[PDB]
Amino acid sequence: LMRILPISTIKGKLNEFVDAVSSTQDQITITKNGAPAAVLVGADEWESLQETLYWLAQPGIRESIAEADADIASGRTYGEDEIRAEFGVPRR
């Protein structure tokens, strides 16, 4: 959901609007004098966005994902015992 709301609609229901974006991808553009002034989103949503920004900026990101996706489809993956033994990082 992508709601545009006056600040008067928010005031007094702050708990509820915060609860709503918190548990979802919803955003609220908050207007003041009819003009957008701020945006409210969930904390988890804000993190998702920051990490998306990070990853999209990395070189060969899409090619990486396509190659890793082809590994997944062929079973070219390694589990804990194999990785710990190849890289010399024993448990315990």
């Binding site: 998702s48 990070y54 990853w55 997944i72 990082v89």
Partner: protein, 81 residues
């Protein structure tokens, strides 16, 4: 309870480029906290990255998928500062 964590061949290549202390930290996280709560330690990505998750740690980030049907986490890429 804990998910089975796997590294793709692609992500394994990334591991080989890490300093040994960071390599060890990645391995301990991947088969520890990540295995226990992959939806808590990472976040789902958006736009064209929808379907993947990023876990940000001090010096490195892991890019991964979560397959709930088979209780598996698969690492796609490891990046390090």
């Amino acid at each position: 309870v804990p998910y089975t964590v796997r590294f793709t061949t692609t992500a394994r290549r990334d591991l080989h480029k890490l300093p040994p202390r960071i390599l060890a930290a990645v391995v301990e996280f991947a088969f520890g906290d990540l295995s226990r709560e992959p939806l808590r330690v990472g976040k789902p990505l958006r736009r064209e990255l929808a379907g993947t998750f990023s876990a940000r740690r001090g010096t490195y980030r892991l890019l991964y998928r979560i397959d709930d049907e088979h209780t598996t986490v698969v690492i796609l890429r490891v990046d390090h500062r």
